Amino acid sequence: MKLAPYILELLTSVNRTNGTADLLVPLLRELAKGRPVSRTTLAGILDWPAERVAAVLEQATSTEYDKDGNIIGYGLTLRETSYVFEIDDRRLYAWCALSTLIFPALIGRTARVSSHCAATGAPVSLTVSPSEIQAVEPAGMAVSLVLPQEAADVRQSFCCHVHFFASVPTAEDWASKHQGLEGLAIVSVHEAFGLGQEFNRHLLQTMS
Template identity: 65%
Template sequence: METSTFVKEIAERFSVINRLHPTELLLPLLREIAKGSPVSRKTLATVLDWPADRVAAALDQVPSTEYDDDGNIVGYGLTLRETPHTFEIDGQRLYTWCALDVLIFPALLGRSAYVSSRCPTTGEEVSLTVAPDGLHRLEPASAVVSLVRPNASSDIRCSFCCHVHFFASAAAADDWVAQHEGA
């Protein structure tokens, strides 16, 4: 498939997902999670200047949102729970749901991040530094990121994020891509 067609298809599917997710929630919640502690619904309501029922309704639309045992938010793209993608920002060790998140979140948060991940086929470490203005360092330099066409599910993590990885090289990604339809 032609690259421009593939990118257009991904963008169209994300537009469906974005209609299901309250985008005005994303940036304030990312900023709160980036502080490194669970975020209560009350704190989020205060930050957003929303009533509690609107916060609850917005969060209910995002089935991937992670909570701790006390009902506090611990993950929404950026997470306090360990994943394959370590995302260090201002000395705070956090994680992301997918490789694409680490490329986007520094620009959204306005802060640089040191990222470490493992190639799922070789086990080799892929590390990078991403600043708000773009990628500043990538090791190995041959590393690539996988992209898949997300389905129309409201669960972005299962439909997209769990399939977006860093690979040490295009060759390392080849077998994985061959086994994953839509990659």
């Protein structure tokens, strides 16, 4: 299918203000270590004042913090979700299906991803590298997409509708009982991975 409007609206969304793109990649690489990330640690990596770092993060309303005020969730998260995302010996989680497909290229590591079909509850898993996916089980795995909304919180308007399914038929059956959700579409995990690749290329083509 035609992916340009998905890529465009997703890109538009992360350019909240200048900073997000350039903050996003180091933050993900820190979260991938499996521990909470301090605002000062980010500042060291970015060479920004911590208050600039906070100014970027305050625009991102779904950012998760722990009891110590450290960052534990931003696309990748230490707080349990349906999308398990393991790097090395650390279990991490992700906000949605497409996240799991995108973030391995950004952090430069292969991830072991596992979830459950949102229609049937069947387990699903794959290995996601910066350049390819492997071990897709079951092989006909599918992904739901919706159109992101620009000024909406990305987690509540996009991530919460973007799931893994055991198969395209299963997913399409499920989709026929959702309506009004703008841009709802079912694709194979391969097409979603390709989507994530175009997204990343565009997003990286515009950092410092």
